[PDB]
RNA sequence: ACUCGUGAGAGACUGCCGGGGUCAACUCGGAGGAAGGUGGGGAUGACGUCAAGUCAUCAUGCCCCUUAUGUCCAGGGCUUCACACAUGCUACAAUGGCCGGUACAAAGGGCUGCGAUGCCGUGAGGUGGAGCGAAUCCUUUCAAAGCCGGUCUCAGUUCGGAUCGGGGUCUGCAACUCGACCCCGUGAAGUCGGAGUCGCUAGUAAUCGCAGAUCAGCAACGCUGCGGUGAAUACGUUCCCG
């Protein structure tokens, strides 16, 4: 999560395989989700603070 | 250690409402990204101002950013000069147009977030920490209508090497009860020796109000 | 007429009744060709054997869900509550033998950190 | 019976009796016995020498067997071990060739175990 | 026909919103199908709840999507104006098909 | 099985090398293709990252991609 | 459900073809896992092969083999003071039926017939005459019980 | 009308009868009832512990680099292998293998995505685009184990699929080091596993497929879930463990 890599994953890559997800809030490269664009830690803290609309803690 | 779930995230289905509210299919990751950069943009000057809540309602791509604070007068300086600057920068950073509503809490000392604000901002200011808390309370204990409180402070307290946690309270703060209406706020003091993370639980009442 | 819903594990059956000499219509099939196991054949006709109207009264059933055996036990239930819906004085004789009471046993939720529900990963502490 | 070079057993069906040759498995038995016309259910005791003739001429004519396959491959493995490939290096050192796991498993290439 | 399919996160806000649509079109006067519950969709997301190694001891966050349906038959433009005129909760997105 | 790779930089260089009938040791980055049999006879300095290994290309090399006539790992064990 | 007292057990339905508690219980102890229907095909086919080799009611042959393998005393492994004592204890009825059916199935499973049906048929027949290995395990269990009669006093 | 879908509501409270209870709590049986006594499972981790984990999610005090300990790219490595451990998967066969016929799920997923009938292949797939932002279209009307039938006759085998050779397809600028899948051949160890040890008390164990997230592709036998078929035993606290 260095600013060269946080910034480098947002440019247009020179090949299409080279574009990867990289969670927006912190820049964490592994364990990023597609619907949120947030890693598991930012999903857990933001979903705990009610900041994400309607994802809530599960129990079936 | 204490594996205590964030109670605003433990009652966010039942009592406490979401802070951000919309509907989004295939636009959701963009709305998340704008929500994040808005809250970072409202961190600094409003954390000087006394910010407590940042709600973002979002209609058909306009936006509605609403802030609950404790002084309309630092958020709104000269009319449009302090408001429309951060409002206009929200209009430029987002690719949208911002309708910023700003409103006051009727009592700042019974918001757990604002109690954590005043406590941690005192604790960066070299005061006695047991005096701060103990005065964190006395006030809030009161004043409205507020059936608990529980303040915990960890970190380099007083500049000591050991990271001593402290635990003061008064009344009833039941966390396992879900009809609790507990406000929770953790804000982190910034001393030269380090950061003193302050957690404040405030139990207003039994009332479901369903 | 009278119609009954019998609910077993995730199966559900809708068995109705009419008076006639013995016939059993499943989803387009006969009872001996839909249930080839001959034990479920008792497990569904046992409410008919209890209040002994095995041949006098016939079920027109439709179903959904489950597997074979969930549909079997469901159809037991629907025959049984249908036999409440024929004569209520058949009802204390059903419930006494163990009937009219669907089994609430369902496949429970898998738990995180386990191989299945109630099965820990086998640990060898050193 | 006798065939291309594999001594057939006493009592096996034809789609298994053909399989005991190096070039033939189950699917080649299902295609050879469909092309020639011998019943797959025939035992080896009940096999006809003219069926050995037509079957034998078919499967030496349109398919390869024991000597071709073996000194046949074994010319291709030594082909890639002569020219200096990396798979040649794997066949040299006695390691798995497909680039698979070498740290714990791949014991079927290293063989019997010596422990240090 | 104009068929309105509305989706949201709150069952309460979508029930009062469907009460606004039924009271609106019923107020202007038309043949309208009442609120029909299409069932849901749930997105269950399992999160390793440690900023580091604790592969066991998760917490998984669901996502409820409520889907209500109101079918509108015989549209008149005095009724069609009030559709685009007011939407009260605005956490509901309205598909007009 | 359709259009195979080709190493267009090495392709341009190789053609120039064989039009002039000149043979030169080549420091080549490319580990990815020995595409045509036009590469026969040319010496390739294959680059495993760290040094260049000279490789003669003969008729049997066709169908083996260029990098692993030079190996990248070293192992002895004792 | 131990240490709180006795726990209530599930009632077991009888057989459709033969009409016995003991046939169905033999099926549920034949059940190498998953295939109760295939367990029913093994038990039913084996008992009609017993019907072939007897010409009688198969459940009478089954209960006579079940009686001829059924033990009366079982040995324990209780350890008083640095020596392991084989302690003989009276066997309950359900425990004795369980040891009879479980020994019958397992030592049918060791026997060398081709299918499972011929194994279970020959083991129910040989246990009916008294010539299986399972009857020899009943005699070895009573050998350990009668050989260890003295330690039984603890009243345990 | 029946389901079913999702909204509101009733319903389990020792409430009703019998006995023990100090006439107290509570316990043993009975009735009604879909359910009987915290009905089943979740979500829910008190004060603290262990200087447990993480300065690599993030934030950060102090110290260090600032012509490199920053940064840009190609190639390589993270996949090496005489070993040793650990969790899994496929097995060692007849309750089985292989061929043919046939019946029943639940949940899910889908925009530069899911992609049908048809045609070309043996098959991965190719050509083509019906139709769907989806209780509608597509994932075939959805399964597999099941049942009916035939064959195999106990064997290192019609068990077992590792390995290796040839031949392909698809994804991608690119499958050499290092992808998966299909076809033909090849056909090893392995005959239920020493001391030891692990899981589980009812829709559980065991076994059987299915979907999902991450993802262009996949090392997925993983993880999270969904349903199908479905047991045995618990005499009881002497012993081991907390």
Swiss-Prot record, chain A:
GO terms for cellular component: cytoplasm; small ribosomal subunit. Its cofactor is Zn(2+). Pfam families: Ribosomal_S14. Binds 16S rRNA, required for the assembly of 30S particles and may also be responsible for determining the conformation of the 16S rRNA at the A site. Belongs to the universal ribosomal protein uS14 family. Zinc-binding uS14 subfamily. Part of the 30S ribosomal subunit. Contacts proteins S3 and S10. This is Small ribosomal subunit protein uS14B. It comes from Mycolicibacterium smegmatis (strain ATCC 700084 / mc(2)155). The gene is rpsZ.
Swiss-Prot record, chain D:
PROSITE patterns: RIBOSOMAL_S13_1 (PS00646), RIBOSOMAL_S13_2 (PS50159). PANTHER family: 30S RIBOSOMAL PROTEIN S13/40S RIBOSOMAL PROTEIN S18, SMALL RIBOSOMAL SUBUNIT PROTEIN US13M. Belongs to the universal ribosomal protein uS13 family. One of its GO terms (cellular component) is small ribosomal subunit. GO terms for molecular function: rRNA binding; structural constituent of ribosome; tRNA binding. The lineage of its organism: Bacteria, Bacillati, Actinomycetota, Actinomycetes, Mycobacteriales. InterPro entries: Rbsml_uS13_C, Ribosomal_uS13, Ribosomal_uS13-like_H2TH, Ribosomal_uS13_bac-type, Ribosomal_uS13_CS. It comes from the Bacteria. Keywords: Ribonucleoprotein, Ribosomal protein, RNA-binding, rRNA-binding, tRNA-binding. The gene is rpsM. HAMAP family: Ribosomal_uS13. GO terms for biological process: translation. This is Small ribosomal subunit protein uS13. Located at the top of the head of the 30S subunit, it contacts several helices of the 16S rRNA. In the 70S ribosome it contacts the 23S rRNA (bridge B1a) and protein L5 of the 50S subunit (bridge B1b), connecting the 2 subunits; these bridges are implicated in subunit movement. Contacts the tRNAs in the A and P-sites. Signal peptide: none annotated. It comes from Mycolicibacterium smegmatis (strain ATCC 700084 / mc(2)155) (Mycobacterium smegmatis). Gene3D superfamilies: 1.10.8.50, 30s ribosomal protein s13, domain 2. Residues 94-116 are annotated as: Disordered. Part of the 30S ribosomal subunit. Forms a loose heterodimer with protein S19. Forms two bridges to the 50S subunit in the 70S ribosome.
UniProtKB/Swiss-Prot annotation, chain F:
GO terms for biological process: ribosomal small subunit assembly; translation. The keyword Cell division does not apply. One of its GO terms (cellular component) is cytoplasm. One of its GO terms (molecular function) is rRNA binding. Keywords: Ribonucleoprotein, Ribosomal protein, RNA-binding, rRNA-binding. It comes from the Bacteria. Belongs to the universal ribosomal protein uS19 family. Protein S19 forms a complex with S13 that binds strongly to the 16S ribosomal RNA. This is Small ribosomal subunit protein uS19. The lineage of its organism: Bacteria, Bacillati, Actinomycetota, Actinomycetes, Mycobacteriales.
From Swiss-Prot, chain G:
The keyword Transcription regulation does not apply. GO terms for biological process: translation. Keywords: Ribonucleoprotein, Ribosomal protein, RNA-binding, rRNA-binding, tRNA-binding. Gene3D superfamilies: Ribosomal protein S7 domain. One of its GO terms (cellular component) is small ribosomal subunit. GO terms for molecular function: rRNA binding; structural constituent of ribosome; tRNA binding. It comes from the Bacteria. InterPro entries: Ribosomal_uS7, Ribosomal_uS7_bac/org-type, Ribosomal_uS7_CS, Ribosomal_uS7_dom, Ribosomal_uS7_dom_sf. Part of the 30S ribosomal subunit. Contacts proteins S9 and S11. Belongs to the universal ribosomal protein uS7 family. NCBIfam families: rpsG_bact (TIGR01029). One of the primary rRNA binding proteins, it binds directly to 16S rRNA where it nucleates assembly of the head domain of the 30S subunit. Is located at the subunit interface close to the decoding center, probably blocks exit of the E-site tRNA. This is Small ribosomal subunit protein uS7.
């Amino acid at each position: 999560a260095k600013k060269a890599l946080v910034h480098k994953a947002n440019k247009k890559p020179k090949f299409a395989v080279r574009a990867y997800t990289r969670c927006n809030k912190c820049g964490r490269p592994h364990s990023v989700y597609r619907k949120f664009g947030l890693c598991r830690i930012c999903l857990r803290e933001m979903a705990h603070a009610g900041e994400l609309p309607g994802v809530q803690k599960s129990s079936w | 250690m204490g594996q205590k779930i964030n109670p605003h995230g433990f009652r966010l289905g039942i009592t406490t409402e979401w802070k951000s509210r919309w509907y989004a299919d295939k636009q959701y990751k963009d709305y998340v990204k704008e929500d994040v950069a808005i809250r970072k943009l409202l961190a600094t000057g409003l954390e000087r101002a006394g910010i407590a809540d940042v709600e973002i309602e979002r209609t058909r791509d306009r936006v509605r950013v609403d802030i609950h604070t404790a002084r309309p007068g630092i958020v709104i300086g000269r009319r449009g000069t302090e408001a429309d600057r951060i409002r206009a920068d929200l209009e430029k950073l987002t690719g949208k147009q911002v309708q910023l509503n700003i409103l006051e809490v009727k009592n700042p000392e019974s918001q757990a977030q604002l109690v954590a604000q005043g406590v941690a901002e005192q604790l960066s200011n070299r005061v006695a920490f047991r005096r701060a808390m103990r005065k964190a309370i006395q006030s809030a204990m009161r004043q409205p209508n507020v059936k608990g409180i529980r303040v915990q402070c960890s970190g380099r307290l007083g500049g000591a090497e050991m990271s001593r946690s402290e635990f003061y309270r008064e009344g009833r703060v039941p966390l396992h009860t879900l009809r609790a209406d507990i406000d929770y706020g953790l804000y982190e003091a910034k001393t030269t020796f380090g950061r003193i993370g302050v957690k404040v639980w405030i139990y207003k009442g039994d009332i479901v109000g369903g | 007429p009278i119609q009954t819903v019998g609910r077993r594990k995730e199966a559900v059956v809708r068995v109705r009744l009419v008076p006639g000499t013995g016939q059993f219509n499943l989803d387009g099939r006969t009872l001996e060709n839909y249930f080839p196991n001959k034990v479920h054949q008792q497990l569904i006709k046992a409410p008919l054997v209890t209040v002994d109207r095995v041949d006098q009264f016939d079920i027109y059933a439709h179903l959904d869900g489950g597997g074979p055996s969930g549909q079997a036990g469901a159809l037991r239930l629907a025959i049984a509550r249908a036999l409440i819906l024929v004569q209520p004085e058949d009802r204390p004789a059903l419930k006494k033998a163990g009937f009219l009471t669907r089994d609430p046993r369902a496949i429970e939720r898998k738990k995180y950190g386990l191989k299945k529900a109630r099965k820990a990963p086998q640990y060898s502490k050193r | 019976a006798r065939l291309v070079g594999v001594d057939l057993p006493r009592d096996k069906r034809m789609e298994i009796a053909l399989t005991y040759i190096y070039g033939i498995g189950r699917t080649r038995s299902n295609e050879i016995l469909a092309a020639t016309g011998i019943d797959k259910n025939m035992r080896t005791k009940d096999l006809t020498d003219d069926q050995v003739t037509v079957l034998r001429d078919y499967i030496e004519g349109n398919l390869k067997v024991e000597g071709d396959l073996r000194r046949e491959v074994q010319a291709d493995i030594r082909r890639k071990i002569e020219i200096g490939c990396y798979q040649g290096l794997r066949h040299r050192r006695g390691l798995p060739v497909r680039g698979q796991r070498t740290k714990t498993n791949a014991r079927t290439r290293k063989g019997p175990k010596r422990t240090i | 026909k104009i068929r309105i399919r509305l989706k949201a996160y709150d069952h309460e806000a979508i029930d009062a919103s469907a009460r606004k649509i039924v009271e609106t079109v019923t107020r202007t006067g038309a043949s309208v199908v009442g609120p029909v519950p299409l069932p849901t969709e749930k997105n269950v997301y399992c999160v390793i709840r440690s900023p580091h190694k604790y592969k066991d001891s998760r917490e998984h966050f669901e996502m409820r999507t409520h889907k209500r349906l109101i079918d509108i038959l015989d549209p008149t433009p005095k009724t069609v104006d009030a559709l685009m005129r007011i939407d009260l909760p605005a956490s509901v997105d309205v598909n007009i098909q | 099985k359709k259009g195979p790779f080709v190493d267009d930089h090495l392709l341009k260089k190789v053609d120039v090398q064989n039009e002039k009938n000149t043979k030169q040791v080549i420091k080549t980055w490319s580990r990815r293709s020995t595409i045509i049999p036009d590469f026969i006879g040319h010496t390739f300095a294959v680059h495993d990252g760290r040094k260049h290994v000279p490789v003669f290309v003969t008729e049997a090399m066709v169908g083996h991609k260029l990098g692993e006539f030079a190996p990248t790992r070293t192992f002895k064990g004792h | 459900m131990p240490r709180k007292g006795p726990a209530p057990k599930r009632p077991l339905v009888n057989d459709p073809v033969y009409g016995s508690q003991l046939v169905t219980q033999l099926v549920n102890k034949v059940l190498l896992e998953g295939k109760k229907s295939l367990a029913e095909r093994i038990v039913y086919g084996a008992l009609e092969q017993a019907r072939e080799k007897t010409g009688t009611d198969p459940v009478v042959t089954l209960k006579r083999a079940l009686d001829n393998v059924k033990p009366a005393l079982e040995v324990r492994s209780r350890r008083v003071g640095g020596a392991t004592y084989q302690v003989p204890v009276e066997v309950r009825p359900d425990r004795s039926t369980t040891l009879a059916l479980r020994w019958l199935v397992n030592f049918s499973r060791q026997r060398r017939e081709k299918t499972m049906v011929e194994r279970l048929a020959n083991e129910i027949l040989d246990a009916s005459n008294g010539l299986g290995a399972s009857v020899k395990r009943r005699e070895d269990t009573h050998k350990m019980a009668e050989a260890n009669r003295a330690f039984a006093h603890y009243r345990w």
